Amino acid sequence: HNLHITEKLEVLAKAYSVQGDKWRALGYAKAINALKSFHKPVTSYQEACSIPGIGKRMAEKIIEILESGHLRKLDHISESVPVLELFSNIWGAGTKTAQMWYQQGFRSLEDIRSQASLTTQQAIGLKHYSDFLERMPREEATEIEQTVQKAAQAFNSGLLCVACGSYRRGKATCGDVDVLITHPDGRSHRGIFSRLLDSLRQEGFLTDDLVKGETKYLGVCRLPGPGRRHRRLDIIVVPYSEFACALLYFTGSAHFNRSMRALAKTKGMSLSEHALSTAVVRNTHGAKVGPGRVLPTPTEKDVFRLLGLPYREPAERDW
DNA sequence: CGGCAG
DNA sequence: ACTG
DNA sequence: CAGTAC
DNA sequence: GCCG
Numbered sequence: 001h002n003l004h005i006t007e008k009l010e011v012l013a014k015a016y017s018v019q020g021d022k023w024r025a026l027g028y029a030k031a032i033n034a035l036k037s038f039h040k041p042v043t044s045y046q047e048a049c050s051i052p053g054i055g056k057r058m059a060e061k062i063i064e065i066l067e068s069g070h071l072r073k074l075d076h077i078s079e080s081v082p083v084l085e086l087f088s089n090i091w092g093a094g095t096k097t098a099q100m101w102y103q104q105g106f107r108s109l110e111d112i113r114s115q116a117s118l119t120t121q122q123a124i125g126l127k128h129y130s131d132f133l134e135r136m137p138r139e140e141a142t143e144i145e146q147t148v149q150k151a152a153q154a155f156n157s158g159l160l161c162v163a164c165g166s167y168r169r170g171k172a173t174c175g176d177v178d179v180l181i182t183h184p185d186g187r188s189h190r191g192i193f194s195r196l197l198d199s200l201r202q203e204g205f206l207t208d209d210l211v212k213g214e215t216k217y218l219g220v221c222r223l224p225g226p227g228r229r230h231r232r233l234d235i236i237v238v239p240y241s242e243f244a245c246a247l248l249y250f251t252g253s254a255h256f257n258r259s260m261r262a263l264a265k266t267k268g269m270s271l272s273e274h275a276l277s278t279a280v281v282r283n284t285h286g287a288k289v290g291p292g293r294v295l296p297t298p299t300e301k302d303v304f305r306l307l308g309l310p311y312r313e314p315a316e317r318d319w
Numbered sequence: 320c321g322g323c324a325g
Numbered sequence: 326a327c328t329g
Numbered sequence: 330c331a332g333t334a335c
Numbered sequence: 336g337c338c339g
């Protein structure tokens with residue numbers, strides 16, 4: 001659509017993200033998306049200024065791209081950015097870890113493997129560096145969800161297991177599998193992890209653990225047989241009282257969740273993976289000094305409704 | 320000025 | 326929400 | 330807590 | 336980076 005611009009802008013956006021300038025990177029991100037929501041190639045500097053999320057600086061840069069044919073700033077990106085991206089693509093390693101590794105002289109994953117002090121999570125991330133960067137076919141994601149469900153419904157047939165994330169949004173490929181487990185009885189979800197995970201371990205399905213919380217588990221799995229890659233797996237067990245808000249959170253997308261939660265804030269409300277709250281007292285820094293009333297949200301439609309929004313099917317949330 | 324989801 |  | 334991830 |  002406007003790929004003549006976005007391509008060059010995405011490079012600068014990633015340059016900012018890996019370097020730790022999150023908000024400026026966030027600004028570039030929102031502009032990139034907007035430039036993807038336009039239908040007519042931007043033709044004037046004031047045409048860009050008309051686009052939401054595009055300002056004078058961004059408008060000017062896009063003007064430079066049209067007449068000049070390229071963005072000059074792209075040529076002053078630090079030489080460190082490719083290395084910082086390489087390092088930050090290790091699961092468990094962020095900008096702060098990547099910059100420190102660079103300051104310490106590390107420039108390759110061979111350096112990291114041989115010299116860097118890695119956390120347990122990071123050592124698992126490095127081991128699966130190539131696999132965690134690969135997406136998977138929807139069909140494989142189905143096999144993985146079913147594998148978790150059968151293991152869960154074996155020790156309690158009432159458990160409800162739902163694959164969320166990009167899968168539920170109907171995407172052709174999934175970066176990783178996101179499973180939401182609950183129980184309609186309101187109490188039978190408690191303490192299932194210990195046995196659910198052990199069942200999944202004894203089979204060989206679960207290969208590594210990254211996070212093991214009371215409510216969330218994040219780890220690595222590999223389906224049986226030949227030609228299989230290691231895949232990232234997220235499991236969240238929640239009380240039935242929050243099933244709707246959790247399903248909405250875990251279905252996403254991430255930018256959809258952030259926009260909704262921002263809307264709730266304007267309307268004096270707060271939306272979380274746990275509940276949609278009202279009468280939310282907030283302070284100067286847009287900060288919640290006091291919580292309010294949990295609003296009844298038995299279904300996803302209730303959240304949309306309580307927020308004054310038309311219901312959006314999961315596939316309509318892929319922002 | 321300062322938030323940008325929780 | 327987790328981790329250390 | 331800071332860092333990281335979802 | 337944008338925007339109220």
Ligand SMILES: Cc1cn([C@H]2C[C@H](O)[C@@H](COP(=O)(O)OP(=O)(O)OP(=O)(O)O)O2)c(=O)[nH]c1=O
Pocket residue numbers: 164165166167173174175176177178249250251252253254257335
């Ligand atoms: C990463 C992220 C996810 N989420 C929510 C919405 C996501 O759909 C859900 C799962 O996270 P992800 O699995 O990271 O996102 P995704 O499944 O939609 O895309 P992908 O195919 O690459 O896996 O968690 C947030 O609310 N905020 C975030 O920053």
Ligand SMILES: [Ca+2]
Pocket residue numbers: 165166167174175176177178
């Ligand atoms: Ca996912």
Ligand SMILES: [Ca+2]
Pocket residue numbers: 165176177178234
């Ligand atoms: Ca995930």
Ligand code: NA
Pocket residue numbers: 087088089090091092093094
């Ligand atoms: Na990382």
Ligand code: NA
Pocket residue numbers: 105106111115
């Ligand atoms: Na070295």
